[PDB]
Structures are given as structure tokens and as C-alpha cells.
Amino acid sequence: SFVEMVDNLRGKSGQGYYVEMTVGSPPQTLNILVDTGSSNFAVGAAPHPFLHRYYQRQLSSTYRDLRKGVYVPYTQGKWEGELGTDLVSIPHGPNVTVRANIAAITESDKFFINGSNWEGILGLAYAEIARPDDSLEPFFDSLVKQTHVPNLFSLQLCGASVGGSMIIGGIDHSLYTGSLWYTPIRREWYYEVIIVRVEINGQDLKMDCKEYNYDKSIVDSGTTNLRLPKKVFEAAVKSIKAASSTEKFPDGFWLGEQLVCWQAGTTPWNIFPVISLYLMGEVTNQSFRITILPQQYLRPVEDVATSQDDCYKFAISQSSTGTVMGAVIMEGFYVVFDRARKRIGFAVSACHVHDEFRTAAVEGPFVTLDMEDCGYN
Numbered sequence: 001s002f003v004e005m006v007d008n009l010r011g012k013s014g015q016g017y018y019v020e021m022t023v024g025s026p027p028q029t030l031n032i033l034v035d036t037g038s039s040n041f042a043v044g045a046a047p048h049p050f051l052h053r054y055y056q057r058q059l060s061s062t063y064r065d066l067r068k069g070v071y072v073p074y075t076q077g078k079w080e081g082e083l084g085t086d087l088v089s090i091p092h093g094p095n096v097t098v099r100a101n102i103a104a105i106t107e108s109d110k111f112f113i114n115g116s117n118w119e120g121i122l123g124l125a126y127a128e129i130a131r132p133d134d135s136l137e138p139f140f141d142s143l144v145k146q147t148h149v150p151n152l153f154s155l156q157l158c159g160a161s162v163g164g165s166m167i168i169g170g171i172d173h174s175l176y177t178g179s180l181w182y183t184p185i186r187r188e189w190y191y192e193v194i195i196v197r198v199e200i201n202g203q204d205l206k207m208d209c210k211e212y213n214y215d216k217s218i219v220d221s222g223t224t225n226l227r228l229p230k231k232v233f234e235a236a237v238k239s240i241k242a243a244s245s246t247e248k249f250p251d252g253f254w255l256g257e258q259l260v261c262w263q264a265g266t267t268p269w270n271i272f273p274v275i276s277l278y279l280m281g282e283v284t285n286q287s288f289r290i291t292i293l294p295q296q297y298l299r300p301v302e303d304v305a306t307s308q309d310d311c312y313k314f315a316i317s318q319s320s321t322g323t324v325m326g327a328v329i330m331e332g333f334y335v336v337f338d339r340a341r342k343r344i345g346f347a348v349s350a351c352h353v354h355d356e357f358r359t360a361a362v363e364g365p366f367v368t369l370d371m372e373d374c375g376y377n
């Protein structure tokens with residue numbers, strides 16, 4: 001019965017992916033962003049210039065007030081609101097109804113985006129990072145507790161506006177080719193993983209693999225970019241600069257600010273390298289790799305000028321809170337969040353990224369010694 005959930009996600013480039021949900025009795029329809037980087041379910045519940053609609057608690061006969069406040073500060077953006085419970089459904093999802101915690105957003109700063117078409121957020125990670133604390137049961141935990149839906153979900157995010165699939169409760173085999181490769185969920189808070197090797201155009205960055213996971217590595221559908229710790233970011237940019245020195249770019253392009261354009265159809269893809277991230281495997285001394293094409297980390301953006309070229313922003317940026325495997329990493333892979341077995345699976349997506357002479361891939365097995373040393377403590 002998973003076919004009912006194929007293509008249930010929509011989005012705009014750089015603005016996240018969302019699914020349709022209803023809350024309350026009678027049902028109120030809202031678009032909800034899917035975020036594996038947080039654990040709170042929250043919706044606009046008061047007028048805002050960028051909200052087309054919002055949750056109206058006064059109109060739901062099943063609303064219950066929890067008489068407690070809540071606020072969530074993300075990397076970029078924040079909101080505050082009031083906690084309660086209500087009934088929730090997913091029209092293009094499993095045929096069930098759950099009573100869930102809901103944060104009703106009353107005030108916000110740089111959270112809602114002008115004309116994005118979503119009005120709330122579904123944090124899919126674990127209770128340990130929920131606000132105000134880990135006693136607020138996240139939505140997916142409530143879903144599993146109250147229904148027969150199995151404790152796993154999968155995400156197929158398709159690139160550039162954009163679409164995809166969230167399969168709730170299983171794996172849909174028509175959405176990927178080849179084998180799935182699994183990496184352990186290191187700890188149930190974020191979806192935390194361990195990167196054990198990095199290569200650019202086949203050359204090892206040759207750093208202490210602890211640097212790759214300082215101070216953590218997470219899979220985060222709610223962040224656009226690949227975000228790298230300072231030392232790793234500097235090594236990667238230096239290598240991508242050298243591979244592309246045939247041309248030259250403003251230094252603000254490498255900082256993610258300025259865009260770059262070429263005459264339509266003449267983007268020089270061949271001069272940007274491929275990036276391979278090796279992840280810890282399921283058996284002793286075994287890893288596997290995923291390979292990222294430049295069509296993934298050069299995010300296409302609308303040309304604000306009168307010319308009609310192809311324009312892009314550099315979608316790798318610096319972090320001080322660990323590695324973030326964001327949406328441009330997840331695009332073109334089928335990613336399985338297998339919570340029951342504490343693991344995350346990767347395979348080549350049916351909506352994979354195309355190049356002319358190169359292809360995104362998930363390949364294994366590889367042998368990697370001392371993988372346990374790569375985790376940061």
C-alpha cells in the first residue's frame with residue numbers, strides 16, 4: 001500500500017520539502033516541512049505576513065491545551081509558542097489518525113519564508129533533542145505507539161519546482177536501483193553517523209578522520225547545504241578551487257554569497273570534482289561510499305538579471321557544530337531511516353542526478369581499519 005505515498009512531497013529549491021497534513025476536528029489542512037534535523041512538531045497558529053493560513057485552535061473540538069510554553073532555536077531561525085495536543089492525519093500517507101503534541105507558533109524570527117507554501121514543521125529525530133525537554137514525545141514516536149505502522153520511514157528527495165516521496169512505515173522498491181548500504185545510527189538524538197574517509201576526484205583528503213566528525217555528523221533534510229567543520233571545509237575548498245582553476249570566480253562565490261552564471265547550456269560541469277564520503281558499515285572493518293556530483297553542490301538559482309543564463313550558488317559551507325549532510329547530499333539517493341534496527345540506508349534514487357560522463361553512486365564493500373577511532377568524544 002506504499003504506492004499511495006509516492007510523490008507526496010513538494011518544495012521550492014533551497015526552501016525544504018513538505019507534506020500535506022491535517023490537524024484538529026474538523027480537519028484543517030496545512031503544508032508541513034519534513035525535518036530529520038529536529039524533533040518538534042509545530043505550526044503557525046497566528047497571523048504572519050508570510051503565512052497563507054494557520055492552525056485555529058478555537059475551531060477544533062479535539063484541541064487540548066497543555067498550559068506550558070515552548071521555544072526552539074535552530075541554526076537559522078527561531079520561534080516560540082504554546083503547547084497542546086490534537087488529532088493529526090496525513091492524507092497521502094498511512095490511513096490512521098494520531099493524537100500528537102503540537103507547538104502552536106505565536107511569534108517567530110526568520111523562520112517562515114516569503115512565499116514558501118508551507119506553514120509548519122515536522123521534526124522527525126529523537127526525543128533527546130526535543131524542546132522544552134525530552135519528555136515531549138515527538139510525532140513519529142506517537143505514531144508508532146498508537147498504530148501498527150512499523151518504526152521506520154524513507155525519504156526520496158528529488159532535485160531541481162522540486163518533488164519527492166516520504167514512505168511512512170517501509171521501503172518502496174520502485175524508488176531505487178542497486179543495493180541499499182547501511183550505516184549505524186551512532187546515538188539516538190540527531191540522526192548521527194560516522195564518516196571514516198573523504199575523497200575528492202579520487203584523492204584522499206588525508207586528515208585524521210576525527211576531523212570529519214568534529215563534533216558530530218548528522219543527516220538533516222531541513223538544511224540545504226553540505227556543511228563541513230572549518231578544517232575540513234578549508235581543505236575541500238582548496239581542492240575544488242584547484243580542480244576548477246581553468247576559470248576564476250569572485251571569492252564571495254566560495255563563501256556562498258555571490259552566484260555565478262554561464263551562457264545557457266554551457267555550464268562547465270567537467271571541471272568540478274566529485275566528492276566521495278565513506279561511512280561506517282554494518283560488519284567489522286567494513287565501510288561503503290557515496291559519491292556526490294557537482295550538479296548536487298552547485299545549487300541552481302534564478303537569475304535576478306535580464307539575461308537568461310544558468311546561474312548557481314556554491315552549496316558547501318562552513319560549520320562550527322559538526323558535519324551536516326543536508327538536502328543537496330540527500331537528493332538523488334533513497335535514504336532509509338531504519339529506527340527499529342538503529343541504522344540508515346543509502347541507495348541510488350530513481351530520480352538520480354545526471355551527468356554526461358559521470359554518475360552518482362553508492363558502492364561497497366570497502367575495508368577500513370580502526371573506524372571506531374573516527375568518532376569524536
Ligand SMILES: COCc1cc2cc(c1)C(=O)N[C@H]([C@H](O)CNCc1cccc(C(C)C)c1)C[C@H](C)CCOCCCCN2
Pocket residue numbers: 014015016033035037038039072073074075076077111121129220222223224225227317
Ligand atoms: C548554511 O546553513 C544555514 C541553514 C540553512 C538552512 C536551514 C538551516 C540552516 C536550519 O537551521 N535548519 C533547521 C534544522 O532543524 C537544523 N538541524 C540541525 C540543528 C541545528 C541547531 C539546532 C537544532 C535543534 C533545534 C535540534 C538542530 C530547520 C529549519 C529552521 C527549517 C526551515 O528552513 C527550511 C529552509 C531553509 C534550509 N536551509
